[PDB]
Amino acid sequence: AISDADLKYLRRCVDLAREALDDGDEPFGSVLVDHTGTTLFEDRNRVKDDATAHPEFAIARWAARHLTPDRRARATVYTSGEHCPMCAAAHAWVGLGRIVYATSSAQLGGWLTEWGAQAPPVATLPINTVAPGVVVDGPAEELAETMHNLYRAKFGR
Amino acid sequence: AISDADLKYLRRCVDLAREALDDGDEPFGSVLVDHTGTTLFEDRNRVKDGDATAHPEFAIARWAARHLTPDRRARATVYTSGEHCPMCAAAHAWVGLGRIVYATSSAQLGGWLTEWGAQAPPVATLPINTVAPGVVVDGPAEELAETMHNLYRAKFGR
Numbered sequence: 001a002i003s004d005a006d007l008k009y010l011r012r013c014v015d016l017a018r019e020a021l022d023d024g025d026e027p028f029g030s031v032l033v034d035h036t037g038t039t040l041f042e043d044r045n046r047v048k049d050d051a052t053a054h055p056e057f058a059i060a061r062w063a064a065r066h067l068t069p070d071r072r073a074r075a076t077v078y079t080s081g082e083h084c085p086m087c088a089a090a091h092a093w094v095g096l097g098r099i100v101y102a103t104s105s106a107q108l109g110g111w112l113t114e115w116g117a118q119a120p121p122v123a124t125l126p127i128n129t130v131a132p133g134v135v136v137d138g139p140a141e142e143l144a145e146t147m148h149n150l151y152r153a154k155f156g157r
Numbered sequence: 158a159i160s161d162a163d164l165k166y167l168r169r170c171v172d173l174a175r176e177a178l179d180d181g182d183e184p185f186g187s188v189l190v191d192h193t194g195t196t197l198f199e200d201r202n203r204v205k206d207g208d209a210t211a212h213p214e215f216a217i218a219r220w221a222a223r224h225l226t227p228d229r230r231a232r233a234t235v236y237t238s239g240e241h242c243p244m245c246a247a248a249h250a251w252v253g254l255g256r257i258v259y260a261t262s263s264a265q266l267g268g269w270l271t272e273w274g275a276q277a278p279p280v281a282t283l284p285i286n287t288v289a290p291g292v293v294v295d296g297p298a299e300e301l302a303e304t305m306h307n308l309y310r311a312k313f314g315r
C-alpha cells in the first residue's frame with residue numbers, strides 16, 4: 001500500500017539522491033516523518049564528506065538522539081533505495097516504524113550486475129530478513145525508471 | 158581455526174564485555190588488532206544512554222575507516238566476544254576490514270535467549286557470512302562458552 005501521500009515523500013527522496021549524485025556522492029536519499037505528518041529529518045549519502053555514511057543509518061541515530069521510543073515507533077522512514085542490512089538493522093535496533101522504499105535492493109543488485117560492477121561486499125538482503133518485525137512497503141513502479149537513471153549516472157560503465 | 162594467540166585476544170574481549178555490564182551496559186566487547194599483532198582500538202557496548210546502535214564492532218568499523226588505509230584494514234583482525242550482529246557485520250564489510258574471530262556465535266546467543274524465556278532481539282541473528290559473504294570468520298571458542306553463557310544470563314536472562 002503506497003498512497004499518493006507516500007509517493008510525494010518518495011519523490012523528495014529521489015530529489016535528495018540526485019542532490020547527492022550532483023555533489024559527488026552516491027544517489028541515496030531518505031526522509032524521516034512523524035506520525036503526525038511533519039518531516040523530522042532528511043538526509044542523503046555522504047560517502048565523500050566513510051562507506052558507512054548512509055542516510056538511513058543517520059536517520060536511525062538522529063531518531064535515537066532526538067525522539068522518544070514512542071515517537072520512533074510511530075514514525076515512518078521513506079527511502080529512494082531499500083535499506084542495506086547495516087541500515088535495516090540500525091532502524092530495528094532504535095525501534096523505528098514503517099519503511100517505504102522506491103526501489104528494492106534486488107533491483108539495484110540486478111542493475112549493478114548488468115553494468116559489470118563487481119559485487120558489493122554486503123549481501124542485498126530484504127529488509128525483513130534482517131528486521132523481521134518491520135512493516136515494509138515498496139517498490140514504487142512510478143519511480144523505477146527515474147531511479148534506474150540515477151543509478152546509471154553513478155554506477156553505469 | 159582458534160589459536161592460542163587468538164584466544165588471548167578473545168579473553169580481552171570478555172573482559173571488555175564484563176566492564177560494560179559492570180557500568181550498566183550490555184556485555185559486548187571488541188578489539189582491533191593489526192597484522193603486526195598490535196592492538197589499535199578496543200571498545201565495548203555503550204547503549205545505556207539510549208542509542209541501541211552503540212555497538213563496539215560498529216565503532217571499530219568507523220574507527221578503522223577514519224584512521225587506517227584500505228590496505229591496513231584488510232590485513233587487520235577484529236576480535237569480539239559475540240558474533241557481529243547484521244548492523245556490525247555490514248559495517249565491517251563496507252569499510253573493508255579483514256578477519257573476524259568471535260568467542261560466542263549468534264546461534265549460541267539466540268538459543269540461550271529462548272532457553273531463558275527472553276524476548277528475541279528485533280534484528281535477526283544472521284551469521285556474519287549471510288550478511289558479508291567474503292569475510293573470513295573464525296569461532297566460536299569452546300573454552301569461553303561457559304563464561305559467556307553466565308555473562309549473557311546475567312544481563313538477559315532475568
Ligand SMILES: C[As](C)(=O)[O-]
Nearest residue numbers: 028054081082084
Ligand atoms: C539503500 As542504502 C545503500 O543507503 O542502505
Ligand SMILES: C[As](C)(=O)[O-]
Nearest residue numbers: 185212239240242
Ligand atoms: C555482537 As553485537 C550485539 O555488539 O553486534
Ligand SMILES: [Zn+2]
Nearest residue numbers: 054084086087
Ligand atoms: Zn545502508
Ligand SMILES: [Zn+2]
Nearest residue numbers: 212242244245
Ligand atoms: Zn552489532
